[PDB]
Amino acid sequence: GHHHHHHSHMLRTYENKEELKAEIEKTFEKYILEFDNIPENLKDKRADEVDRTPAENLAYQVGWTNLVLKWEEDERKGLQVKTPSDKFKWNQLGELYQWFTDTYAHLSLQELKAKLNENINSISAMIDSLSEEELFEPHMRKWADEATKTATWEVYKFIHVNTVAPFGTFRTKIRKWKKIVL
Numbered sequence: 001g002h003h004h005h006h007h008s009h010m011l012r013t014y015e016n017k018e019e020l021k022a023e024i025e026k027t028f029e030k031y032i033l034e035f036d037n038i039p040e041n042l043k044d045k046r047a048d049e050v051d052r053t054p055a056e057n058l059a060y061q062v063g064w065t066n067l068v069l070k071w072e073e074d075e076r077k078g079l080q081v082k083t084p085s086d087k088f089k090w091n092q093l094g095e096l097y098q099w100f101t102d103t104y105a106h107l108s109l110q111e112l113k114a115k116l117n118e119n120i121n122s123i124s125a126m127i128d129s130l131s132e133e134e135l136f137e138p139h140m141r142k143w144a145d146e147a148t149k150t151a152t153w154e155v156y157k158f159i160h161v162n163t164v165a166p167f168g169t170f171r172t173k174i175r176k177w178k179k180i181v182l
């Protein structure tokens with residue numbers, strides 16, 4: 001079911017936890033830097049050949065990182081987890097994305113950047129909290145095995161496709177937006 005994820009074709013091998021954390025921080029910094037000169041008054045400005053506004057772009061990352069953190073926190077607390085979310089299934093990502101916009105896009109860029117920054121720090125704490133086995137071997141978290149229909153994904157794959165991969169593709173999109181609008 002997780003193959004419905006839009007970055008399922010951008011998987012990566014990692015050597016260890018440190019390599020994973022370093023890549024998340026590097027790609028996050030390059031992505032977030034692009035918003036430094038985007039004014040709040042243009043956060044909802046839509047460019048023609050770009051799907052999302054700057055706020056919707058940030059809202060998407062806040063949305064997904066909030067979900068990954070929730071799956072693990074809920075499991076840590078002994079709960080049974082529904083993925084990708086309680087309201088939407090893996091074949092309803094389009095609706096989940098609109099929910100991200102409705103839930104988060106109205107916030108200021110400053111507030112969205114603060115939330116994403118906090119989430120990157122929490123994801124690093126999560127990586128540090130799991131053994132190398134829990135992170136890199138299959139069948140270590142019930143939430144990661146929850147939707148499997150074809151190939152199994154280890155915890156690190158879920159972290160990677162929701163951080164390193166979109167930070168790269170959405171950085172391309174926000175740069176395109178700035179070239180047009182600014």
Ligand SMILES: [Br-]
Pocket residue numbers: 050051052057173
């Ligand atoms: Br976009």
